[PDB]
Design a binder for this molecule. Structure first.
Ligand SMILES: [Mn+2]
Ligand SMILES: [Mn+2]
Length: 181
């Protein structure tokens, strides 16, 4: 019953652009992706989920995730200067053009209401919509408003499902699940 390397899995079941954005993301904090390999996969995963979330409806969302902080804040500032909206204190992951609000996407290996509540306490602003996903098909969103339809979110959760089980087949899942706090 062999145990695999998380880094290899990350470089084998994730798209090279995703991986590059993850590497850049960790580098911008100086973190080494060889000490924090579960964080590497968590970031690749979160990235992919945000991207799929935007892909579910083209021309509806603006992506903030994966950008430089300078540029991401530039986009946020532009949007808010266009709408007059409150500049959130923390960088959100998306902007919904249809409901005209910012979205924070969270992905958790733990219970979704816990992650949701921790996000809610952390981000201060009650104007930023929150959407949390798990690797087990569970999701938790603000005001029971899930933005996307069932098929799209099922697409996302199916991808997550795949990630989790492909992790499992390499023995990576237990440590990855345990690593969160
Ligand atoms: Mn983010
Ligand atoms: Mn997020």
């Amino acid at each position: 019953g062999p145990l695999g390397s998380m880094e290899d899995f990350v470089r084998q079941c994730f798209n090279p652009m995703i991986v590059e954005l993850a590497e850049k993301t960790m580098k911008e904090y100086g973190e080494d992706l060889k000490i924090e390999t579960n964080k590497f996969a968590a970031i690749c995963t979160h990235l992919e989920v945000c991207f799929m979330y935007s892909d579910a409806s083209k021309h509806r969302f603006e992506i903030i995730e994966g950008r430089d902080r300078t540029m991401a804040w530039t986009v946020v500032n532009s949007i808010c200067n266009t709408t007059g909206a409150e500049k959130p204190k923390f960088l959100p992951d998306l902007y919904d053009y249809k409901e005209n609000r910012f979205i924070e996407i969270g992905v958790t290996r733990r219970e979704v209401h816990i992650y949701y509540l921790e996000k809610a306490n952390k981000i201060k602003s009650e104007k930023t919509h929150i959407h949390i996903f798990s690797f087990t098909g569970e999701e938790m969103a603000t005001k029971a408003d899930y933005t996307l339809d069932e098929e799209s979110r099922a697409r996302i959760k199916t991808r997550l499902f795949t990630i989790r089980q492909e992790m499992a087949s390499r023995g990576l899942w237990d440590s990855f699940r345990q690593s969160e706090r």
